[PDB]
Amino acid sequence: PVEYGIFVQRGATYTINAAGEFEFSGRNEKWDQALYLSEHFPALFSDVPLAGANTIIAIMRLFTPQGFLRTDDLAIAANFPRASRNPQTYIPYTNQRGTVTNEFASRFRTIVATLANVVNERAVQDDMQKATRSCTKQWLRHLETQFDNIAVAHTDHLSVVYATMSNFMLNFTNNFSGNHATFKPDQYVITSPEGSYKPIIERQGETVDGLTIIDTSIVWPILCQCTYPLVRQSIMEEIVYPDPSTTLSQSLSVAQVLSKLTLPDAFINMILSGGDSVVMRTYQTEAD
Amino acid sequence: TVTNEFASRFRTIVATLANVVNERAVQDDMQKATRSCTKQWLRHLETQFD
Amino acid sequence: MWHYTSINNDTRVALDPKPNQIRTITKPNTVPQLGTDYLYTFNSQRRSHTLRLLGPFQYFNFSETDRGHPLFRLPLKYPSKAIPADELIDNLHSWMRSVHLLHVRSEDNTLRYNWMLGVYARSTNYTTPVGQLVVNAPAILNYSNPQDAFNSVFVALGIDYIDIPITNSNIFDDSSTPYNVRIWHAPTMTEVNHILALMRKSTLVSTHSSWHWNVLHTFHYRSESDMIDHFAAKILEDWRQKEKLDKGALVEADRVIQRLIPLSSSTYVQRLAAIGALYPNEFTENVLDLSRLSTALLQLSDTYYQHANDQLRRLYRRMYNDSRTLYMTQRHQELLLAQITADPNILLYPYTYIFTTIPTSMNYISNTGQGRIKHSLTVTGATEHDTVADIVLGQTGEDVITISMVEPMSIAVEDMYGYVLDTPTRDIWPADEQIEQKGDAVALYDTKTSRALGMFNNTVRIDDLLSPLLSLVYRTYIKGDTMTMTQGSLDHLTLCAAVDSDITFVGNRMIAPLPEGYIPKPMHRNNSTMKMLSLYVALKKLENFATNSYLMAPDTSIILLGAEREPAVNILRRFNRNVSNVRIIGMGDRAVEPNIRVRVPFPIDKNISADFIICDINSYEDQSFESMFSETISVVTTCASAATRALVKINHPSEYMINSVIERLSQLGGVFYHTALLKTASQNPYSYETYIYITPIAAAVRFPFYSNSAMINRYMTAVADDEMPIIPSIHTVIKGHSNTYSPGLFCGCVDVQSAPLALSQLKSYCSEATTWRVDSDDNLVNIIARIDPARIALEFRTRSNTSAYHEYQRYVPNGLGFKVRKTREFRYMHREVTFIHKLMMYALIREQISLTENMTQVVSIGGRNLADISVVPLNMKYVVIDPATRIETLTQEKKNIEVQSRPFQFDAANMDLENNSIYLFIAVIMNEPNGAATPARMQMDKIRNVATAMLTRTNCVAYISFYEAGIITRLDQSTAHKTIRVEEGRLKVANYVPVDTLVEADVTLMLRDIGITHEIIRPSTPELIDACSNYGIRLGSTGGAVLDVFNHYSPVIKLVR
Amino acid sequence: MFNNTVRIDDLLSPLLSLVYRTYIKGDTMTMTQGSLDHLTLCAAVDSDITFVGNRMIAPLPEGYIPKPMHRNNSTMKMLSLYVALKKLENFATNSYLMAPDTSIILLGAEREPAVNILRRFNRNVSNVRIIGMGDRAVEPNIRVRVPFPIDKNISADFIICDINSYEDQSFESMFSETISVVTTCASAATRALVKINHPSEYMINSVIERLSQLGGVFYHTALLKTASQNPYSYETYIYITPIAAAVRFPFYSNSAMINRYMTAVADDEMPIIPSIHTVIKGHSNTYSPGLFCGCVDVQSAPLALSQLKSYCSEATTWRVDSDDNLVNIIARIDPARIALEFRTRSNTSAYHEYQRYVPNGLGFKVRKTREFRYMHRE
Amino acid sequence: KYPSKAIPADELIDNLHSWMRSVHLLHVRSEDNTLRYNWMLGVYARSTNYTTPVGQLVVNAPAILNYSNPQDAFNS
Ligand SMILES: Nc1nc2c(ncn2[C@@H]2O[C@H](COP(=O)(O)OP(=O)(O)OP(=O)(O)O)[C@@H](O)[C@H]2O)c(=O)[nH]1
Ligand SMILES: Nc1nc2c(ncn2[C@@H]2O[C@H](COP(=O)(O)OP(=O)(O)OP(=O)(O)O)[C@@H](O)[C@H]2O)c(=O)[nH]1
Ligand SMILES: Nc1ncnc2c1ncn2[C@@H]1O[C@H](COP(=O)(O)OP(=O)(O)OP(=O)(O)O)[C@@H](O)[C@H]1O
Ligand SMILES: C[S@@+](CC[C@H](N)C(=O)[O-])C[C@H]1O[C@@H](n2cnc3c(N)ncnc32)[C@H](O)[C@@H]1O
Ligand SMILES: C[S@@+](CC[C@H](N)C(=O)[O-])C[C@H]1O[C@@H](n2cnc3c(N)ncnc32)[C@H](O)[C@@H]1O
Ligand SMILES: C[S@@+](CC[C@H](N)C(=O)[O-])C[C@H]1O[C@@H](n2cnc3c(N)ncnc32)[C@H](O)[C@@H]1O
Ligand SMILES: [Mg+2]
To answer: How far apart are the CA of B41 and the nearest CA of chain A, in angstroms?
Structure first.
């Protein structure tokens, strides 16, 4: 509560200035997703040190990504459409070839060490019995084991699937930069002089059949009740290398549709473009 | 407001009562488990109160 | 000294170790040492720890395993306080032991080990293709030619570049990095060109003017703000560097143009690049605030975007439209050419332009950092003003400025205990003189003395004046910090006056340490305590003058006749604890115990006697003058009868009252009472109350009666005022050349832009003006400036309104102060007694001058820096004849002031006194122009010469100030004279050489022999009140005691024709 | 260039900070009240220091670590000018404290740390005015232009001017400005100590002539140069003071302080930047002044020493460790050795003696070594 | 926590310091020198956590707290 008071006095959110300094609101307000497209950022993720709130800064350091920012090279060679002037994707984990210890696991190990210290301090503050406390620690170390055991598959296999999917035709935007402090998606619109603009990204709230609601709980099945072709190796599942043709032919189909979909609209608006007009008076400076 | 002032008062109240009930507990040399149970019911009350 | 001399070098390459040195690069055998292997600092204010590895390690990527080490867990383990050096050293040591960089040691001396790729491969745990290539073939890390170090691995991998993460400098922060540095396979200049041109078509990329390891490397930013903060730091670096180069010093510039070259960026970065390449004068002048650098840089750019100078504006615009081009002055370009001639295949940025630097004459004053500026405003300047609009000053909070009523005194402890004497002068007291003095005394007592004088007396309390000094003695004794002092010393008496507890020396000159855990309460003193103490010291010094110890002799007694609690009796009892047998008692009508409660005259039955008596009796009740007279007579009589050394207070020290006292002492049988008037420094500075000092002596006293005594004049000249006392106003609206201001002070704030104007306007009133901004971010500038009557008397002589506004605009914005601390001005500032007497003499002479009719001019010979200007009316012409006076022909012509600038000849033939003229000779008669004192006979001679010389011209009035002889007799007997002295019989005011004094009788006899009209006036109480009310000056204590006897003995001869 | 590289501030920093680190541990102890070591202690630390008694500085309050004093480049020079004025008022003195009831003015001022250090130095002395008074002055120092405004009154027993126009200006303007500066400085004190940025014979003689033109005071004068000045600056402190006698031989000619400036003139060649050579040619004489610096196989080492004897008069060498076979060498080039060795074409050397060195006979040092491009000499 | 004896200066200073760090008053900084900030209404609005109508009016428009003329601070 003390560090929280000190933290939230600075502000619940912030905005980057044109000079690049951070400017925190000073107000304690609950966040809404309406703010995701706004100038505003959640203040927890600023990674700016505060004088009395060190525990909060350090705990939020655990949320820092362990991946890397691959550039979409194969998607460039194909001339696949890309909104960014240099296309790039954040891949969540590195390949870990030849290592005895997985770096992705070791990070999580330090993470649970920190969380162990935190949960323990909260435990002695609540004067709770030793046995439950050790049970929490045991479940933590158990998690760290499950995480190593899964980590080899997440790093050495899933990463090449993210890497391969980064090159696909329709994945046309940058997803992340790796900086939670500053990453704000680029926000194009289809503005017209004689109308309001349509944002391409909007909180239109249509769930698209549940596409836009995000259950975090899904990490639990991943860590605990799922198997992978790499983890299994003591049977050796052969890896699958899916044919290009299925997604390419789909991506092309889409591109073929939406290419021509605008055409009649395009033609007529092309003709009428010169036709917009302003009323104007012409006063005469001289006789005749 | 994000935090209700009426709740936060009761929060400080149960903090005080927690200190008091705990001191009376160590004076009566009572076992740790019951003591933590009292604290747990207190924090539970604070939640119901918010 | 135009051409730059710099030794260019690839410092980042020199840092890469020889391969043989890598095995021991961590120094495994020994503890890492601070200041060589690391730098740790804990900033207790921000509560942030910061470790920083030195040597090759300053560039170290950390593996997530390395982060798991307890070392990095340390700052969390010590949230609030510094990590102890033991733990820091042991943790850094063991973590250092853990690191090991893959390498193959070799014999050839030409090799270097590619530290970047080595530690980078280690950090990723040898997983990335560079990491694999390294773990398989570590010998790849060795390189002869720096560039081929990377070409070997680009060729080995077939990749066009490696994207390498940057380390943070502090190793404790784990924050995600603002950018990363890509490294390109570009062996020749042509490849570098192609990569740069491709880079100029892609978001958020930038680069250096030249590259370390001679290998092209680009910065790639995660967000625009990061690009901005990087560009900022680099601009700062190149500006500092160019500044050092321009001074012509040899410098080890690692690269000639330190700042980055955006290849693709937002607008704001292009602005940074533009003003950055300008190397604007503002940086050398410190006009920018570096605390918020990029902001300031953005701001600077805007002015340059719309600059009044066409050259700088077209130049900046040009740089903004060609941001990809690197801009450099010629003196840089020659260094680039030298760098190419040394190493022909060096890579540097292909697209460049050589602009000529544009000179700018604006020499801004500036100083970031604490300290208010104490301006001394000029009367005049090059700038002319025409009808400047009134400038409102803002309201200020108490957080910035406060205004205490009176400046507390600063003083040595001994100085408080001093006193001044005034011996009787008259040999007889004729009855007509008695009736006259009685009439004046009755008329004076019947209507209370001046309300203004009583105001100053009631505001300048001595208790508050001495509190800061006295409490300081308490706080030091309380810590045990105080130590050595003599038993009878005045510092000992002050220590007794500070604390309620008894103090005792453990031996000679050494006070006892306090008992453990004990913190004695400070002594309770009412307003009259310290005065009673100084009267005690006074009686001690009067019993014999040589003494240093002030303890009572054994078997003796003293009575403090006026008493309530009388803390002084307790402090004194405490002071003398080591002395055997010393009666000490108060004895007032309002007395509480220990002091006996009793009326005076003493009841006939009661027996009272002592070696000393210190009366302080004073009737609180309003009463008839005859009753007060009979009461004070009975008081002095009973006080004299009961002791060998009385020290009576006199509340109403009229000449009639004191003479009645001496006459009544004369009427008592068989004892000839020597007597003297007295005034201690611990009295309230303005009180006219005076301590008569009776004491028997075997001889009858020649000249026993008083007339024109200084202590008496302090009272008698005060009378009911014709005007209400002048309360000091706090002005805000500065009118341009107004002269409507009552005495007080300007105080407020303005925009920093208006600030040069406001100073230029108030120079009309204030002689000086402190200013400051609270902080670098707050744009308001606070100003305080008290109004000097002398500056008003100068500036309003003519209607011209010149000022140094052009000079003042060199101040904005950093050149006029910073102070986060609250400042506290006083309505009544301290001033030395000499200065005060000078101002009083000026008030006397000025009021005297306004009465005079039809005189064309005032001539202040010996006027120095126009010191007498307050005296002369705004109309009549002013003249100075001080050889030492500085000439200012613009100021003289603008302000109607001639300046003779030659020594003045007192010889009657040489004399050239004008008709209708007022000749001031204030304090100049006693000194030769070179500063040596003139002998008193020569002084009398030059006075006689001025008299005979003005004897002929029909309308003239001279004011010859001089020092009367009697004062040397008094200062020989006094104590409180920190300023005035008596070195070998001559007065030594201030720093001035001692100078022989005239006797008033011989001078008056001489003026009577001359036959000229004269009148030896000296300034009085109302004059003092005028000087204090006008200048905003509180008197102070030592000045309060010395001022009467000092003022009386600086007579002003007033020759008139 | 030499003036801008050989700064006095950096030159005196290692000594001054050493006084700070010792005072900080409480390791420092005895010194006289007026002693120069005391003045250095005042110049090291921001906090007021006080002796507990004769010759004994007070121990630090527990837990207290006072910040070192902030000195700009001209601080120590101002201090030495103070010491200079003290020694000039009388030569026998050891105490450098101001006499009670006296004053001094540091006429050129910014922050002027020296006024603070000096105020701190004299805390035990009663009544001593000490103030800076520059046009750029921050408080405590009064901000004011010179010549003094006619209304303002200024005087002191001592004046230490350091006025220097930052702006480029005409020679006549600089001349009139320095004349008004020396005049106002002399008029205001019994012992001025003016700086002269351009100490030509004409300028100094103009100063003495202008002092001659003032009525009634015969000004004895002398040129002066303190050790705390930057070693190469030609800037010179003229020292005015009244004396009863007229001064025989008042004008300057061929004064050393003046010659330091007047003989310097625009160069016919660019300044010689010191190179760091690596390739040792056998008997070459093509080397610009600088120093050889590098490493060779321990086997080649006797040869390399035998070759560079042609240039360097002496050469430090060492191997970093017993296992590392490279031997580092540093050797600055002596012009005198070049002038000796290149008199004839013969190339004799004690190579037979040098091969007695390999491998253990030519050095070991694990510690980093730090050569300077510009070594000290008496 | 200290029923009988004085709170040690260390604990008092550290606690008052961190609590002081926690407080923050809504305000809009301005250039005009004539302004004053209405400290009463500011801290009062803060204490009620910006719930009362003055608190709302302040959290929405902090610039309302600045005043030239002292009386108009409340009239606004
Ligand atoms: N990871 C890593 N980065 C390095 C290493 N050496 C230099 N860098 C980075 O390379 C960037 C550019 O190198 P330089 O041109 O030599 O130096 P700089 O641009 O002035 O930046 P700094 O010297 O670090 O302030 C810097 O930001 C460094 O962080 C290294 O050994 N390892
Ligand atoms: N809550 C709050 N009350 C204030 C503030 N300022 C003044 N007051 C209250 O206003 C009342 C009247 O104000 P004033 O006339 O200025 O002062 P006062 O009546 O002499 O009372 P005090 O100065 O507090 O002794 C006082 O009782 C104060 O408690 C403020 O900033 N916040
Ligand atoms: N300092 C500058 N340097 C270069 N170009 C500028 C600068 N300031 C403005 N411009 C140009 O002029 C236009 C002015 O825009 P405007 O001033 O309204 O907002 P801005 O771009 O944020 O600038 P400012 O920060 O001065 O408000 C911009 O489009 C920009 O291209
Ligand atoms: C101005 S007070 C100062 C006393 C003393 N200096 C002190 O405060 O410790 C003088 C006191 O003398 C007392 N007093 C007045 N007339 C007296 C008398 N006739 N005999 C004795 N005491 C008298 C008054 O009661 C008054 O309190
Ligand atoms: C003692 S100082 C101060 C005088 C006085 N306090 C005042 O300001 O008017 C007197 C000044 O008069 C000047 N002076 C001395 N002798 C003089 C003389 N014989 N004729 C004219 N001026 C003289 C000196 O230069 C000195 O500065
Ligand atoms: C070279 S600096 C040295 C000052 C001082 N030694 C210090 O740094 O503490 C000289 C200063 O004198 C100031 N100055 C220049 N002309 C002046 C003048 N005419 N009157 C008063 N000061 C002046 C300049 O502003 C400059 O900052
Ligand atoms: Mg660098």
So the answer is: 11
